[PDB]
C-alpha cells in the first residue's frame, strides 16, 4: 500500500 498526498 502506497499513499502520497494530503
Å resolution of this model?
A: 0.9
Q: What is the length of the chain?
A: 6
How was this model experimentally determined? electron diffraction
Cell of 4: 502520497
SS3 assignment, position 3: coil
Cα separation, 5 vs 1, whole angstroms: 13
Grid cell, residue 2, equals 502506497
Amino acid at each position: 500500500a502506497v499513499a502520497a498526498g494530503a
